Amino acid sequence: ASIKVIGVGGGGNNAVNRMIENEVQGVEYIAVNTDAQALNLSKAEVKMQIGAKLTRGLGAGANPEVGKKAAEESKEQIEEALKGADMVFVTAGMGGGTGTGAAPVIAQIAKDLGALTVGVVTRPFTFEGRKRQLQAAGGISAMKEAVDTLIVIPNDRILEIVDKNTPMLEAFREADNVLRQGVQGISDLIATPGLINLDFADVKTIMSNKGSALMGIGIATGENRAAEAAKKAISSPLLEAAIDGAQGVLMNITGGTNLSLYEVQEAADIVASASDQDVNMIFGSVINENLKDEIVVTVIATGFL
Ligand SMILES: Nc1nc2c(ncn2[C@@H]2O[C@H](COP(=O)(O)OP(=O)(O)OP(O)(O)=S)[C@@H](O)[C@H]2O)c(=O)[nH]1
């Protein structure tokens, strides 16, 4: 009922902006940064500057230690901001200083408060350099110890979706959109009750912080949309392990008012047919009025180990 989405650092805050612009509902947004300048470009209602004393508003200069200590300096404000949350999503681009360093601290505060804590983060593009990869790896494992589930999106695979024409700025806008889809694929099923009844217990069921969780997305229009989006999702480049490896699978099929009973059934059956015979699978369905002839299928795969 109290669902919070908390973006951390530049990348995460940009993802929270795409979410606000697509009027994702049912969630309270919070933006967190060590950089005061960037913070004021956030559209989130609550804007939290962390590590005022340590960084004086100037960012964490690409050092995860500073991001971590910034979030520790602001320990009590993060607690106040999150009090009463049943569920907390923590988004960030891993690789820099504030995301990598602060996101784990914020995730741990949320778990400690009893929130169901899901992380949704990206691993950086290979073109960003070995040092960004290293820093990111470090924060990804830190995050896994601090969340109930960590969804990890490998940015390189985004380049296998958008065309090879795409320059950096547009590539990163796509990353904001994958991050949004990872949060929203889950939050939409739980923010409001759908036509398929789907509760917290159902969602707790697919939660594992043992191994990075992975997501697949598929989008289609036209008369064969259900099967095409289901099939694309199970074949998403973002889904680096095959879906049959997963012990847990959440599936979100979203569509417009013409989303049909047979499509739901078809998409659910495709995804279940690709999955392990003993998978624990929870399916949800939501109507998005703004979609017209397009459907979206998201799968979150967990418990690969
Ligand atoms: N989704 C998204 N990801 C971004 C964007 N800009 C950079 N990234 C990714 O996130 C990673 C971290 O960058 P960023 O969020 O901007 O740093 P920061 O966490 O704020 O860290 P800092 O030291 O500058 S204070 C980058 O390595 C890159 O992969 C963006 O605008 N949107």
* Residue 296 and residue 163 in one domain: no
Q: How many domains does the chain have?
A: 2
* Phi, psi (rounded to 5 degrees) for 169: -60, -40
Q: Give 154's strand partners.
A: 123
Instruction: Give the separation between CA 243 and CA 275, rounded to whole angstroms.
Output: 6
Burial of 43 (0-12, 13-18, 19+ CB in 10 A): middle
Whether residues 226 and 196 fall in one domain: no
- Compute, in angstroms, the gap from residue 199 CA to the centroid of ligand 1: 33
Q: What separation in Å is there between the alpha carbon of 286 and the centre of ligand 1?
A: 31
Ligand 1 atom closest to 99 (CA): 19
Ligand 1 pocket check for 60: Cβ under 6 Å: yes
CA angle 179–35–145, rounded 5-degree value: 50
Q: Are 54 and 103 within one domain?
A: yes
Q: What is the residue whose two structure tokens read 């509760």?
A: 199
Minimum-distance ligand 1 atom for the alpha carbon of 66:
23
Do 39 and 106 lie in one domain? The reply is: yes
* CA 122 / ligand 1 centre spacing (Å): 9
In angstroms, this model's resolution equals 2.5
Report whether residue 61 contacts ligand 1, using a CB cutoff of 6 Å: yes
Instruction: Give distance in angstroms: CA of 270 to centre of ligand 1.
Output: 36
- CB of 101 within 6 A of ligand 1: the answer is no
Whether 157 has a binding-site annotation, put simply, is no
> Ligand 1 mean position to 250 CA, how many Å?
28
Q: Which of 172, 176, 179 to mutate to test the pocket of ligand 1 (most atoms within 8 A of CB)?
A: 172
Q: Residue 7: CB partners within 8 Å, gap ≥ 6?
A: 13, 14, 15, 16, 29, 30, 31, 32, 42, 44, 91, 92
Q: Is 237 exposed, middle or buried (0-12, 13-18, 19+ CB in 10 A)?
A: middle
Residue that finishes a domain, picked among 178, 209, 240 = 209
| 295 and 175 housed in the same domain | no
Are 250 and 186 in the same domain? Answer: no
Q: 109 with 154, same domain?
A: yes
116 in the same domain as 189: yes
Query: Which domain, by its residues, includes 304?
Result: 210-305
155 and 293 in a single domain? The answer is: no
CATH number of the domain at 227, please: 3.30.1330.20
Q: State the Cα–Cα distance between residues 302 and 305, nearest whole angstrom.
A: 9
- Say whether both 181 and 220 belong to one domain: no
CATH number at residue 66: 3.40.50.1440
CA 136, CA 17: separation in Å to the nearest integer?
Answer: 22
Domain endpoint, select from 174, 209, 244: 209
Residues 158 and 179 in one domain: yes
Q: Are residues 170 and 279 in the same domain?
A: no
CA–CA gap between residue 268 and residue 262 (Å, rounded): 10
| Residue 101 contacts residue 70 (beta carbons within 8 Å) | yes
What is d(CA 98, CA 69) in angstroms, rounded to the nearest whole number?
10
Last residue of a domain, one of 209, 228, 248: 209
Q: Is the CB of 156 under 6 A from ligand 1?
A: no
- Is 10 annotated to bind ligand? yes
